[PDB]
Symmetry: C3
Subunit: 403 residues, 3 copies
């Protein structure tokens, strides 16, 4: 196409010894053969600049898991091609002009034993570096045993090895149990993506450093995470629009010295935000929280098994700043668990030194804006409700009621 052997068009690649195989019939095999060509020509630690794999708009079945074990590989389409399969599966589509996602459209038809469409994994040194996924659709096609299970065992992109300077951007994920998993992320960017109608959206597993999750649209399933981070340091979550219906919208476990700022959070279940298992010194600020109830008939009765005393925020850690957030709670009294209970907006489950400052709460019912567990120590609650909206079972909580 261009005068480099490092620029690949998947619709122009012939696999030697498998001439009938196309990008349409199995783009996985085609890209595995492309990665082989790259490894045959890039034969030394000083001749490995990587390459780019172009995916034109079109419908491509992936049957073979692609293994990405080369630094500086870029896989690029020209469109995220997102489509609400969830609405399609549940409504009368008679006269509908389109019935599936498109753009640079990869349908994930992987074997159960290698379920992930893209497995980024290198045994050895150094960390895989500078890999870029952008501007194409990853479509799991269907959920089993019906379209509403948010279950099918398929993953879009799974980074298994310690990685450095990976960039995921302009992607479309639909109808995967797991859209994107990154283990061992240093200097990762997950930026300006459409990740919706997946069991789980973005999983930052193991540990991580200096990562940005920015400017994304995300919506997961009732038994799954929207954003999760395990043992992350200086993770920045900014500019994201988290909508339903994951078990949670944000979930840190053992995360310290991260920041969640200028996001929008709409949840249909309690525990939209969870800082778990001792999260220290985290900034949770300039965020809009909205706790509503399911309006899509097919999901009216599905729940995450948590009651309205769980918190919209549930926080177990030291020295977090939960400040300048708006909480708009609207749940029909007959859909609140337990019956007759006041919903808790912010629950400090435990930890030393946490500060709740400058928070506005609206509810359709009498709610406790802040409940502090008895185990909370040296906690401060400032201008986050009248005195009747603050419950401190901890006897050392300094409270300034909103005047």
């Amino acid at each position: 196409p261009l005068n480099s052997p490092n620029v690949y068009d998947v619709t122009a690649w012939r696999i030697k010894g498998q001439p009938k195989v196309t990008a349409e019939s199995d783009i996985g095999a085609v890209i595995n053969d492309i990665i082989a060509d790259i490894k045959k020509r890039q034969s030394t630690p000083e001749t490995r600049p990587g390459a780019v794999v172009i995916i034109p708009p079109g419908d491509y079945d992936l049957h073979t898991q692609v293994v990405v074990d080369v630094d500086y590989l870029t896989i690029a389409g020209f469109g995220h091609g997102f489509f609400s399969r969830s609405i399609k599966d549940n409504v009368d589509t008679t006269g509908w002009l389109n019935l599936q996602p498109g753009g640079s459209h990869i349908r994930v038809l992987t074997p159960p034993t290698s379920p992930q469409a893209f497995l980024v994994r290198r045994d050895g040194s150094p960390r895989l570096s500078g890999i870029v996924f952008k501007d194409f659709c990853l479509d799991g096609v269907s959920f089993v045993p019906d379209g509403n299970s948010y279950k099918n065992g398929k993953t879009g992109i799974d980074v298994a090895s310690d990685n450095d300077s990976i960039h995921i951007t302009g992607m479309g994920f639909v109808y995967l149990e797991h859209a994107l998993i990154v283990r061992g992320a240093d200097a990762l960017r997950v930026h300006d993506n459409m990740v919706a109608e997946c069991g789980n959206c973005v999983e930052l597993t193991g540990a991580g450093q200096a990562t940005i999750v920015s400017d994304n649209l995300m919506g997961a399933g009732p038994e799954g995470v929207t954003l999760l981070a395990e043992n992350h340091e200086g993770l920045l979550v900014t500019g994201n629009n988290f909508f339903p219906r994951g078990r949670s919208l944000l979930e840190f476990t053992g995360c310290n010295r991260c920041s969640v700022t200028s996001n929008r959070f709409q949840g249909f279940y309690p525990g939209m935000m969870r800082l778990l298992n001792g999260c220290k010194e985290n900034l949770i600020t300039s965020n809009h929280f909205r706790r509503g109830t399911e309006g899509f008939p097919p999901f009216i009765d599905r729940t995450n098994g948590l009651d309205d005393l769980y918190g919209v925020i549930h926080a177990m850690g030291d020295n977090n700043l939960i400040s300048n957030n708006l909480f708009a709670y609207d749940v029909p009294p007959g859909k609140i668990a337990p019956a007759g209970a006041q919903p808790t907006i912010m629950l400090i489950a435990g930890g030393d030194g946490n500060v709740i400052a400058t928070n506005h709460v609206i509810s359709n019912v009498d709610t406790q804006h802040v409940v502090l567990d008895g185990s909370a120590t040296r906690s401060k609650v400032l201008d986050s409700g009248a005195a009747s909206t603050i419950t401190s079972y901890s006897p050392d909580t300094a409270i300034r009621p909103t005047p």
Copy 2:
């Protein structure tokens, strides 16, 4: 170019039977013919993955309105090509090496009866999905009768039918009366664009859900809007730089449970931000506001028809949190309207439970940091000025002055 019929180069496409109609002479007609061919080959609701329309950098005249009525259409250039036609039209251009915009440069020369370059509209189901406009320039060429009317009746992109997961990014819009309009937007993304020297910049009309307006440069004209949203829910506005000279910089009519955070606002008129017609449960935080006066001679006498008592923020609605903003007012006494009036910075025009917290105000003349209408109820004002600077005409407002 690539080995897929779903990739089109506007400079390579010949309209069979019309060898005169080129991308240079009428890029509209070329794109209409390309879309005709997309429809011809993609003739069932399960073979409609869409296409990409590549616009190489150049000067292309658009005479025929393009109608985008296909899902997953990407129209992609290689550069926004922004050029201040406004300075070109008002200073000595002797010796100037360039007098117009460029990049992937579409000159919008549409007839007054089909004035929008791009009409995205589908009478049918479902919602048009996953359309991408990226990395090219829309240039209205001239305002009439002179360069400073911000009037020509032309629109860049007009989404006139309910839509899902549209992506507009890396664009340049210039000298259009309307840059971008999106009716009934769901999961829309207006990201990292240059929308300046247009009568209106981004109008989000009718209703919407789950939209992000992020990381954009935006400057409109005095009878137009910079960003407007009608009846939007869960709209996040973040990381934008709004400069003059729109009638307003942000204008939400009837928007609820939206968020405006981490933006910079510079205007030359009163009412830079307007929450109008019952805006409820919205967060306005972590924003820098600058109210100054017109410095560019050709516009010094121009006004938006509003006095300094309207507010830098004008809010009509319930339970808005206006917090953690810096306000810098610098207007010569002789430019204040009415002459001898104390400028108002934040005006609660009416509504219930609005909270003003932790706002720093600097002004060159004595100003009221907050004014609250007599009709306002359950207002709280905290640490947003000294008592001299807060005026509550309502008797139920709680005020803690800044120490």
Copy 3:
């Protein structure tokens, strides 16, 4: 490649008379001949729409400085190709599968007489407009005399003329004393870049207007800046992840009515943020600051020569809002200068009417959350620590202790 002469592939372009020069041998000489070609075809102020230069993935030497003196020039590649040269230069790389950066990889080998790989400068008129750098790697290859000096005389991109609407996105910069310099920047966007192991990262010099620095990963060298801005007005610095080891992470000199919000800052030295020489009406809000100590052995004894009384924030100017930040200071007591000193988190070195509000400080030792110089006037410190944590040498500081 495409059917427009305004689209160039650096691997496909032969230099007339120098048929021995390739993109590999000297990409600077090829790109200069490409710009020669652009200037031969585009020879009037209305036939100058620019061009895109495509850099395929590969290893390219650049011996010859590139002069970019045309509006709407896009230099584009397919990956940022970032690789930690710093870790490589200080560990056993036996059996390392890769030893340099890649993607669209420009090895910058400039002579000291023309040290900047890309000099963007026009001595003519008007201001250079709409130039786009995206999606390639600039790599200075080595520091001298040793890999740990962060010194080599080289610059990636130096914009030396007043400019308008330049866009720097998806870049990788590594091992350059200066990555990006933009003198006189108007409507500049430095968005979504990897700018690391560079003496200086982003230098915004002379003056500036309406600029956004967003969604960037940045790490500089201990005698150089990460983000510097001089006499910038209305600079928005948002969504960035700033890590060590810059002498500073953010440094303003004479910048007014700017905003630093929703950033992550990690420093190893005092003076991570400096608002120098009369900074006014700036917003420092919703940022996470971490002060730690060098953990990387080669740099353990390496310092920026400042002591712990200098400040995590060091502010000289008027009416700044430093609100809603979290500061996490953890420095082994043996590594605190002077010996036995209380580290300063926020130093108001001078200025009138600055306001510190709603700041949570964590430290391992007794800190002063806020020190205000005797030359400070009309300062205000709200809910940013107990009385014992706020030190005012100035007699007129209004202090509300955290309750």
